[PDB]
Automatic annotation (TrEMBL):
Natural source organism: Nonlabens marinus S1-08
Gene, per the UniProt record: ClR
Protein name in the entry: Chloride pumping rhodopsin
Entry's family note: Belongs to the archaeal/bacterial/fungal opsin family.
Cellular compartments annotated: Membrane
Origin superkingdom: Bacteria
Keyword Transcription regulation: no
Length: 262
């Protein structure tokens, strides 16, 4: 009731497009899961946790997308030419709770391939996860108001954006100060990962603001489209680049299965 999805009836085309976006997302993540599983054997032990974290992200995201898909079809029924709300079973909040889990995994695998270790790894990961959780929690509270109090959505979103900016400053600083440690030419690749991250993660706050500038059924569809683009880019494409960096550094470090795989 606190999300704009509950305010509208949906045409068959809108309803089925959203359903298909979610089910396609399930398939893409679970297909990627198998890929990350199989290639982990070609990653040196020092970096293998990075590929395992991608497996965890894939199944976490895939399970939540699958839950959303079923909740979507549970909540609406085709009545008198449109899909109409029948039950209070759909909200975007499950995405937020999930981010609490997937964002730390995405950040940790970056720090691993940057060759951080020991106290700097633990300390950097701690500040980053705290900043990320602050961002997610304040965003979560904000979107509880996307129907009733747009002013409060904006203020919680400004607080959330402050955490986001500080998080990105930490990430960028560690990347640019440590890329000279990277092997196999991946000092060039990691800079592209950072820019991919900036692009993909910024799509989420744009989706968060849809209720302010497109409060109608097509805005609901656009938000799910943006989430889909952002999810694939921030989790799947990002994970593929992290895995490439892990294998390339594994090979440059003399790990034979990595060398043969490449
Ligand atoms: C606002 C508080 C953030 C300051 C702490 C911090 O960000 O530390 C990052 C450092 O680069 C990691 O060792
Ligand atoms: C809610 C309103 C708040 C509005 C606030 C607007 C400020 C945005 C400016 C920068 C964002 C920081 C993004 C992080 C970019 C990377 C920075 C970095 O990596 O620094 C390089 C380092 O200094 C070299 O070694
Ligand atoms: C796979 C999911 C990812 C990488 C989620 C990332 C989410 C964000 C970067 C969220 C950012 C937000 C803001 C900066 C302000 C508005 C509220 C959020 C939480 C959507
Ligand atoms: C192996 C790689 C492929 C992974 C297989 C994924 C198969 C389908 C996922 C299940 C999607 C079904 C959700 C439908 C829910 C609904 O819309 O009612
Ligand atoms: C079909 C599902 C996945 C097939 C993966 C099994 C292939 C084993 C690869 C091991 C190797 O390359 O030596
Ligand atoms: C309040 C929340 C704080 C959460 C802090 C999280 C701490 C995570 C610390 C680092 C995890 C590293 C574990 C994997 C080791 C990889 C090193 C390697 O195998 O080469
Ligand atoms: C239970 C798991 C959550 C772990 C939280 C620990 C990390 C803390 C990070 C920043 C907290 C930001 C506080 C925002 C809460 C105010 C919203 C409200 O209470 O209405
Ligand atoms: C956590 C950091 C500070 C949170 C400040 C934002 C609180 C907005 C509350 C709006 C209200 O309830 O009237
Ligand atoms: C990220 C979100 C940043 C929020 C930006 C706030 C901008 C001005 C608030 C306008 C207030 C209008 C009240 C309705
Ligand atoms: Br239609
Ligand atoms: Br239509
Ligand atoms: Br190793
Ligand atoms: Br997720
Ligand atoms: Br179905
Ligand atoms: Br490259
Ligand atoms: Br939201």
């Amino acid at each position: 009731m606190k999300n704009i999805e509950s305010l509208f009836d949906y045409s068959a085309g809108q309803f089925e497009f959203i359903d298909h976006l979610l089910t396609m997302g399930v398939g893409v993540h679970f297909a990627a899961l198998i890929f990350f599983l199989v290639v982990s054997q070609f990653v040196a032990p020092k970096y293998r946790i990075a590929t395992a974290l991608s497996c965890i992200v894939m199944v976490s995201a895939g399970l939540i997308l699958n839950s959303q898909a079923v909740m979507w079809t549970d909540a609406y029924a085709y009545v008198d030419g449109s899909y109409q709300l029948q039950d209070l079973t759909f909200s975007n909040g499950y995405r937020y709770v999930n981010w609490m889990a997937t964002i730390p995994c995405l950040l940790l695998q970056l720090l691993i391939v940057l060759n951080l270790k020991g106290k700097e790894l633990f300390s950097t990961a701690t500040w980053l996860i705290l900043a990320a959780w602050g961002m997610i929690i304040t965003g979560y509270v904000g979107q509880l108001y996307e129907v009733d109090d747009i002013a409060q959505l904006m203020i919680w979103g400004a607080v959330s954006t402050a955490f986001f900016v500080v998080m990105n400053w930490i990430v960028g600083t560690k990347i640019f100060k440590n890329r000279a440690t990277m092997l196999g030419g991946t000092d060039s690749t990691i800079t592209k990962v950072f820019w991919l991250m900036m692009f993909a993660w910024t799509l989420y706050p744009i989706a968060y603001l849809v209720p302010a500038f497109m409060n109608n059924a097509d805005g609901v569809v656009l938000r799910q489209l943006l989430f889909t683009i952002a999810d694939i880019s921030s989790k799947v494409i990002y994970g593929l680049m992290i895995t490439y960096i892990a294998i390339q550094q594994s090979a440059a470090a003399g790990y034979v299965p990595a060398q043969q795989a490449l």
